[PDB]
Amino acid sequence: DHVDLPYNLTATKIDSDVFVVTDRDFYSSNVLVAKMLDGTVVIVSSPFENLGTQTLMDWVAKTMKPKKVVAINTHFHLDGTGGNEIYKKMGAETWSSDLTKQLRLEENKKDRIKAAEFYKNEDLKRRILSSHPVPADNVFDLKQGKVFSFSNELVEVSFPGPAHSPDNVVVYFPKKKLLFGGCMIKPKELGYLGDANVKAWPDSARRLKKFDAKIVIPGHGEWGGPEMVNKTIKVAEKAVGEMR
Ligand SMILES: O=C(O)[C@@H]1C=[SH][C@H]2[C@@H]1C(O)(O)C2(Cl)Cl
Ligand SMILES: [Cl-]
Ligand SMILES: [Cl-]
Ligand SMILES: [Cl-]
Ligand SMILES: [Zn+2]
Ligand SMILES: [Zn+2]
Ligand SMILES: [Zn+2]
């Protein structure tokens, strides 16, 4: 059961006050939206650009009516920082690691038109170039992580080590037993390897086994239970082996 939104987003209820919003135009990217017991809404990751993000925020506004929104970037890629322009414009409080902010600014130095070449889809290319990704307004030291407390309901952000990217963090909701693992959760294949640390990935994923989690949410594709971590570890080990 899902609700269809503008620009090919879909919202699925996966629990009480917990939804996954998926951007099916841009690699089926997952965005977690969780309403805290005290009414604060927490958003993890983002759609790639301004139309998807505005659609997301409209739906959050209508269906949850929050007084406060906290948005947490999972890494510097567009499924991660692409929502910041609109989150900030809508009044949300945007957070990321210091390294994530740094890499986002670095990536922005690059020539967009030469960079966005690798879409081929003219409609998507125009949407991409009409957005201009910015870093979060608030930062924490990567290796220290960050803990939010919303009337004693906790949201924990931590760095398990480099894997999909040098800066990838996970977000854990203890009361709801929910882990958003993002793009280091890769149960079938590793995907985009450009910013990846394949050698370090198996131990980085092993660090996620400690979480008491009934649900694990990956950056792309269908979510699952704690077995998502086990599969990832095996996929990561296979790659290390093949490349020696
Ligand atoms: O490995 C991933 O996480 C993904 C594979 S395709 C897509 C996504 C991403 O890195 O955001 C691109 Cl390369 Cl745009
Ligand atoms: Cl800019
Ligand atoms: Cl803290
Ligand atoms: Cl308690
Ligand atoms: Zn549908
Ligand atoms: Zn990524
Ligand atoms: Zn991704």
Numbering used by the authors: 32 to 54, 56 to 61, 61A, 62 to 207, 214 to 224, 228 to 251, 254 to 265, 294 to 314
What's in the article?
The São Paulo MBL (SPM‐1) is widely distributed in South America, Europe and North America, in the Gram‐negative pathogen Pseudomonas aeruginosa. Like other B1 MBLs (NDM, VIM and IMP),10 SPM‐1 has a binuclear zinc center, but has loop characteristics of the B2 MBLs, suggesting it is a B1/B2 hybrid, which, consequently, may be challenging to inhibit. SPM‐1, like other B1 MBLs, has a di‐zinc ion active site with one zinc ion bound at a (normally tetrahedral) tri‐histidine site (Zn1) and one in a trigonal bipyramidal site (Zn2) comprised of conserved Asp, Cys, and His residues. SPM‐1 is distinguished from other B1 MBLs in possessing a “wall” of hydrophobic residues involving Phe57 and Tyr58 on its L3 loop, Phe79 on the loop connecting α5 and α1, and Phe151 and Tyr152 on the kinked α3 helix in the “closed” form, as well as Tyr228 on the opposite side of the active site cleft.
